[PDB]
């Protein structure tokens, strides 16, 4: 089992479309009813859903937000009735310090909800977090929740889908501070999926609805095998151990109109495609640390071995000199059309990601020398006296970059 | 009276620690301790 903590407008939407994808996959009706064709289903549902006496299924989700508008719109959707009104929380009434201050203020009810959800699962495995690191809501609230959660639950995993601000595009003027602080908290508490609007929209090209549909696709494909038990990799901890910051790529990212080219898609061509920097959805002979490829559809392990052999000989990849990939196979949901003969998802750890922080650090250093937009931060208690928090966070990020 | 109530406590609590002892050595009969 698992819980999802989605914050800010970004996280709220991310959750909306993630649950849309899930209910589509598992044959869950918008109202929580189960379709007749899926009555005898074999798919495991406990992982993301828990059924109710009324036979309906409820997501293990909690909605958090500093503002009402987004969730109010969500509850006007056809999927509104599905969620649990008890879990959803809205502030009665764009800065990280303010977000953390509110988090300190509203500890009690949030952790009440979290405890209630936790006690309903026998074998909870970890946590899932969806949020954006730039905006005031996501950054600060995620920081506070991560801190108090790692404190509260020292034996549960914490996984996040953190969305990083666009850089080529000059959105949050105060983004460097929030990003740097959120990164501090991620290193200091997060167990383990980086995301950026820049490269994501780049691949989308070459509305937020479609972008986050792709993101939800990534999340669902990541959790597929856990959802669909097989032989190997039957747990999230198995995933994490096989890799341990990450980046992702998915081959069949094709529009509903781009099915006309039914290209004979082997496993070799897919696994190859997952390697190119173009497909890496995120934007010094930098090299890899780990690679995992989850493959959906018919697959012959002989083909997998041949592809691995050929790629190894062709040396299209580079590895650490000081240490000695993985190809897991799953089964598609029996419901969604198998427009793709075989499909592939890749999650990897690669040193080049360091550059991200070097940019943000460069951004942050490009402001701290002139004290820009610190007036609001001084208002909050945390930065009321000084900003030693900022210095510690910057040095922590520098240490991480040095370690990479 | 004031001196015999404390005798029953030492007498009755001794038999109860015997009941909980034998009801533990078993392979239900184990869920009784949780009762």
């Amino acid at each position: 089992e698992i819980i999802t903590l989605q914050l800010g407008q970004c996280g709220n939407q991310i959750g909306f479309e993630f649950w849309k994808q899930l209910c589509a996959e598992h044959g869950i009706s918008p109202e929580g009813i189960v379709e007749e064709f899926a009555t005898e289903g074999t798919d495991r549902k406990d992982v993301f859903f828990y059924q109710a006496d009324d036979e309906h299924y409820i997501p293990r989700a909690v909605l958090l937000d500093l503002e009402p508008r987004v969730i109010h719109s969500i509850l006007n959707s056809p999927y509104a009735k599905l969620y649990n009104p008890e879990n959803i929380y809205l502030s009665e009434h764009n800065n990280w310090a303010s977000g953390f201050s509110q988090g300190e203020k509203i500890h009690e009810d949030i952790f009440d909800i979290i405890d209630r959800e936790a006690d309903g699962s026998d074998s909870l495995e970890g946590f899932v977090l969806c949020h954006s690191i730039a905006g005031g809501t996501g950054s600060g609230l995620g920081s506070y929740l991560l801190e108090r959660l790692n404190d509260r639950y020292p034996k549960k995993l914490v996984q996040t889908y953190s969305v990083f601000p666009n850089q080529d595009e000059m959105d949050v003027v105060v983004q460097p501070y929030n990003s740097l602080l959120t990164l501090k908290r991620l290193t200091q508490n997060a167990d383990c999926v980086v995301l950026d609007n820049t490269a994501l929209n780049r691949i989308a090209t070459d509305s937020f609805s479609q972008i986050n549909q792709l993101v939800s696709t990534i999340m669902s494909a990541s959790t597929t095998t856990l959802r669909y038990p097989g032989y190997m990799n039957n747990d999230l901890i198995g995933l994490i151990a096989s890799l341990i910051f990450l980046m992702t790529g998915y081959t069949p990212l094709t529009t509903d109109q781009s099915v006309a080219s039914v290209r004979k898609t082997t496993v070799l061509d897919v696994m190859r495609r997952l390697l190119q920097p173009k497909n890496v959805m995120v934007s010094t002979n930098h090299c890899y640390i780990a690679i995992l490829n989850i493959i959906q559809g018919e697959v012959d392990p002989t083909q997998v071995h041949k592809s691995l052999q050929r790629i190894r000989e062709r040396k299209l990849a580079n590895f650490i000199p000081w240490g000695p990939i993985q190809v897991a196979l799953s089964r598609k949901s029996p419901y969604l059309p198998s427009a793709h003969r075989v499909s592939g998802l890749m999650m990897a750890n690669h040193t080049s990601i360091s550059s991200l922080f070097e940019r943000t650090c460069r951004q942050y250093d490009k402001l701290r020398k002139r004290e820009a937009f610190l007036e609001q931060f001084r208002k909050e208690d945390m930065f009321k006296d000084n900003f030693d928090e900022m210095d510690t966070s910057r040095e922590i990020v520098q240490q991480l970059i040095d370690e990479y | 009276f004031e001196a015999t109530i404390n005798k029953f406590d030492k007498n009755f609590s001794a038999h109860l620690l015997d009941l909980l002892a034998r009801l533990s050595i078993y392979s239900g009969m184990a869920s009784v301790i949780s009762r």
Partner: protein, 110 residues
Amino acid sequence: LGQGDFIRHLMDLLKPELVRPATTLYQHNLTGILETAVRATNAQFDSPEILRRLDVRLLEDTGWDVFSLDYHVDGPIATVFTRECMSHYLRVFNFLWRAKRMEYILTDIR
């Protein structure tokens, strides 16, 4: 171990028990644990007949050296297995049990 989903939960519940030495181990306790696993995992949606034969046996140290499933079969179907396939499956089940705890140890360290 071709199920995977069921053996995962079954290795999480036998962990507090098998760590003790074999002398304190008695078969009548483990059956309640096995029955719990078959109920929680996806193995519940299954033919009741074949679930009647699946039980535990105690080989004759530590709890991780004397535990193994049996799946006894008697009757007409026993002419296909003939007491030798059941003396070969158990010879296999050990190698698949060891190579399964040597992995859940290494995902715990990780």
